[PDB]
Design a protein around this ligand. Structure first.
Ligand code: HEM
Length: 292
């Protein structure tokens, strides 16, 4: 069995990590022009997810622990096209705080982004430890977007996620947009794409979606409002079990926030064993809460 035990960066405590959070948050505020004024929040959330979503529950390969996205096999995964922008954003942060591990930095970037975009608090734990280049997972473990609900359910079971966790996590697609050159899909999902809300679910249910091909010859669902849904997004209103949960979150943002926060922490921690004397999870203050 392959076990990864969280090991706190030597001598570091909550306050040290809050300083890293603050540096990420200050740079997020500064770099507001990125991606036609969306800012870096969405791509940092996607980075935190993609470095975690290589995990395989069966043998504990992949996952956030090892920080392996720093190695070219993983950095160059076609599934990760565009994430280099997030890595480049985090580079000056890592320079300022060289003591933090890569997996801790990448995952903390996603937590910081969600919170600074007015999302829920996401508890976060330190202690991911960089592992060598030969531990980098092969490409092909991240999901395809052209597929249906059965594919989504099966995929997420590899990450030990159930229906509620899947539907909650997908709500992150309120953020950012698809970019044709990255993924072969184009467009935002709504008007509020750098503030964290339940808009994904509302737009899934309330827009009039039309199936179209895009300029890369791929099918996607488009609305007159200029929004889009991936086939895997749209699958959440095709499957009866997913549809029930989509309606729940469309009706109740507080419940979505609570479930997202739990699922996202779980995603970022998959594969990691936290020893009993490990610090409790940290809840970082936003810049606003600190007067910064
Ligand atoms: C079935 C699972 C999923 C599929 C197929 C999928 C697919 C995609 C695709 C194709 C894009 C567009 C990339 C680009 O063109 O730049 C995207 C963007 C994004 N994904 Fe997902 N995704 C999935 C799950 C998730 C999850 C679980 C999260 C996080 C909780 C997430 C967060 C995001 C974010 C924030 C963006 C916007 C990035 C940006 O604007 O640069 N995705 N996803």
């Amino acid at each position: 069995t392959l076990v990864h035990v969280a090991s706190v960066e030597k001598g570091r405590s909550y306050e040290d990590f809050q300083k890293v959070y603050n540096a990420i948050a200050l740079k997020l505020r500064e770099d507001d022009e990125y991606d036609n004024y969306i800012g870096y929040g969405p791509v940092l959330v996607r980075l935190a997810w993609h470095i975690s979503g290589t995990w395989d529950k069966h043998d504990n390969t992949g996952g956030s622990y090892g920080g392996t996205y720093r190695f070219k096999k993983e950095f160059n995964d076609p599934s990760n096209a565009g994430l280099q922008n997030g890595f480049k954003f985090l580079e000056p942060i890592h320079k300022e705080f060289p003591w933090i591990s890569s997996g801790d930095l990448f995952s903390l970037g996603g937590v910081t982004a969600v919170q600074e975009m007015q999302g829920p608090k996401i508890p976060w734990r330190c202690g991911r430890v960089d592992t060598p280049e030969d531990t980098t997972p092969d490409n092909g473990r991240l999901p395809d977007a052209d597929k249906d609900a059965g594919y989504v359910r099966t995929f997420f079971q590899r990450l030990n996620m159930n229906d509620r966790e899947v539907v909650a996590l997908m709500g992150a697609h309120a953020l950012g947009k698809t970019h044709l050159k990255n993924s072969g899909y184009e467009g935002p999902g709504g008007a509020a794409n750098n503030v964290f809300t339940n808009e994904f679910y509302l737009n899934l249910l309330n827009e009039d979606w039309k199936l179209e091909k895009n300029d890369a010859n791929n099918e996607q669902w488009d609305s007159k409002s200029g929004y889009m849904m991936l086939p895997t997004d749209y699958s959440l209103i095709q499957d009866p079990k997913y549809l029930s949960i989509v309606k729940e979150y469309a009706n109740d943002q507080d419940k979505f926030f609570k479930d997202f926060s739990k699922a996202f922490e779980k995603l970022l921690e998959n594969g990691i064993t936290f020893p009993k004397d490990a610090p409790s999870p940290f809840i970082f203050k936003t810049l606003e809460e600190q007067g910064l």
